[PDB]
Amino acid sequence: PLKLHGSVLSTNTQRVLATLYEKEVEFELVNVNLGAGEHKQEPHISLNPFGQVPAAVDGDLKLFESRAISQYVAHQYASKGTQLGAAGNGYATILVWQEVESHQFDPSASKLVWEQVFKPVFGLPTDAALVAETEVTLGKVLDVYEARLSQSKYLASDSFTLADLHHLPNIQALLGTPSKKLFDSRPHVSAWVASITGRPAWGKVLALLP
Amino acid sequence: PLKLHGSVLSTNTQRVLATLYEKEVEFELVNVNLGAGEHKQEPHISLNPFGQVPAAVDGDLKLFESRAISQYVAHQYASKGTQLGAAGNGYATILVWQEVESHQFDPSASKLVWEQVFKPVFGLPTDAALVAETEVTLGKVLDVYEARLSQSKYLASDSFTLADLHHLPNIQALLGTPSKKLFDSRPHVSAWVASITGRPAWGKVLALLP
Ligand SMILES: N[C@@H](CCC(=O)N[C@@H](CS)C(=O)NCC(=O)O)C(=O)O
Ligand SMILES: N[C@@H](CCC(=O)N[C@@H](CS)C(=O)NCC(=O)O)C(=O)O
Numbered sequence: 173p174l175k176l177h178g179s180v181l182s183t184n185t186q187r188v189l190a191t192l193y194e195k196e197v198e199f200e201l202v203n204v205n206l207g208a209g210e211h212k213q214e215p216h217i218s219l220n221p222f223g224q225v226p227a228a229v230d231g232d233l234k235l236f237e238s239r240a241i242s243q244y245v246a247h248q249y250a251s252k253g254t255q256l257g258a259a260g261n262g263y264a265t266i267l268v269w270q271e272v273e274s275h276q277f278d279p280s281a282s283k284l285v286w287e288q289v290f291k292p293v294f295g296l297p298t299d300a301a302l303v304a305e306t307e308v309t310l311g312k313v314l315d316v317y318e319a320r321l322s323q324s325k326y327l328a329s330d331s332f333t334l335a336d337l338h339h340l341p342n343i344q345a346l347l348g349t350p351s352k353k354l355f356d357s358r359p360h361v362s363a364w365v366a367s368i369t370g371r372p373a374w375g376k377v378l379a380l381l382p
Numbered sequence: 383p384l385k386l387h388g389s390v391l392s393t394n395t396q397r398v399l400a401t402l403y404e405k406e407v408e409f410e411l412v413n414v415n416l417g418a419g420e421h422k423q424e425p426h427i428s429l430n431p432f433g434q435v436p437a438a439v440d441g442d443l444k445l446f447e448s449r450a451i452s453q454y455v456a457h458q459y460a461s462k463g464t465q466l467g468a469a470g471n472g473y474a475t476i477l478v479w480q481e482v483e484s485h486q487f488d489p490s491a492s493k494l495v496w497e498q499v500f501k502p503v504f505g506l507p508t509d510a511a512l513v514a515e516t517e518v519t520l521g522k523v524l525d526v527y528e529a530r531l532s533q534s535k536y537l538a539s540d541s542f543t544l545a546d547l548h549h550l551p552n553i554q555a556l557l558g559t560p561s562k563k564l565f566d567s568r569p570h571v572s573a574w575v576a577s578i579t580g581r582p583a584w585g586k587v588l589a590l591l592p
């Protein structure tokens with residue numbers, strides 16, 4: 173089986189878990205104790221040299237960066253499970269919205285999740301000033317999404333693709349925060365969020381969040 | 383021909399130009415006047431709804447995000463020009479180092495380029511403190527690169543790939559700044575920078591910069 177080295181409470185690990193479940197790929201989770209700094213020790217730093225989770229080993233291949241592992245699973249196991257790709261030249265528009273997720277959505281979203289979800293469990297107060305200004309940026313991104321999702325059922329096409337999937341971990345995390353209002357207030361975004369978070373493969377990830 | 387809507391002074395536009403020249407794809411530049419704010423006007427905001435450059439139109443396909451356009455060009459025109467992919471499972475490691483470029487390198491490299499190259503052009507001041515701090519961050523990234531490039535001639539394989547190519551615009555821009563020392567002091571990184579910036583396709587990009 174594919175071996176996924178990370179943590180169930182890591183959003184970036186969650187991203188890969190989602191793909192693995194969509195693609196029905198056999199795998200085992202190898203736990204990395206983040207509090208203990210294992211992600212900064214050996215062997216984990218031999219699998220991800222930046223000292224981050226997740227990494228993965230599949231046969232003779234070792235991989236890191238969640239979106240790379242995700243895309244690798246979706247290609248390598250394409251014939252199994254959910255079809256996360258598109259026909260013909262549709263792949264190009266999946267690339268576009270994958271890169272929107274990486275470069276437009278994620279910087280703001282991740283920061284919001286750090287400030288509101290992770291920092292509190294470590295006893296650190298949320299930087300509300302940073303949250304406010306970061307929500308401005310994210311609202312502007314989601315206004316673009318609201319327009320897109322008025323024309324297309326999902327971001328890259330009228331079907332669920334990896335472009336949508338890569339959004340799941342931070343969108344889920346934000347639903348548990350006052351940033352949920354950014355999603356609720358945009359009616360196509362809201363329904364799209366309901367659609368992606370309601371998927372069975374994502375429910376399997378959520379099962380793993382105590 | 384492919385229409386590339388952007389500016390040669392834009393690093394993200396340069397990233398696409400590099401792939402277009404490597405792949406020997408006929409294209410025409412459609413200049414977008416950033417100083418006049420055309421990237422925030424129609425029709426450009428119908429091509430890139432985030433009001434950024436570049437965007438591209440290839441026949442009936444419209445695309446934005448430089449790395450999406452770039453990877454589209456490399457796949458769609460794979461048989462032409464330089465081979466930017468790898469055989470077998472090698473694609474997976476290309477994805478890894480593409481994502482490293484997007485998530486590990488680009489944030490601090492882009493910030494250094496903004497502070498030292500773009501602000502001076504404008505009427506904004508170079509924040510020396512933030513430059514120092516951000517050089518610490520980039521230096522640590524490039525320490526990982528040095529280790530990688532000690533084992534592999536290029537980042538994803540022993541051959542030039544899109545993972546390398548996507549670094550060109552910000553690396554070139556930093557060579558014209560004192561951040562050049564971060565590359566000069568790391569010998570495998572230095573030779574790799576020499577190897578990629580010395581390519582004919584990159585020279586064709588630089589030829590467009592007055
Ligand atoms: N861009 C990477 C980021 C991975 C990442 O930041 N993971 C977090 C856990 S969610 C981590 O390991 N943080 C520890 C650190 O940065 O030192 C990916 O997508 O895999
Ligand atoms: N992630 C995007 C970034 C594009 C980008 O930021 N372009 C700059 C010029 S290099 C821009 O258009 N700036 C105007 C703005 O952000 O308002 C890409 O790779 O294409």
Ligand SMILES: [Mg+2]
Pocket residue numbers: 322360
């Ligand atoms: Mg509607």
Ligand SMILES: [Mg+2]
Pocket residue numbers: 532570
């Ligand atoms: Mg050596």
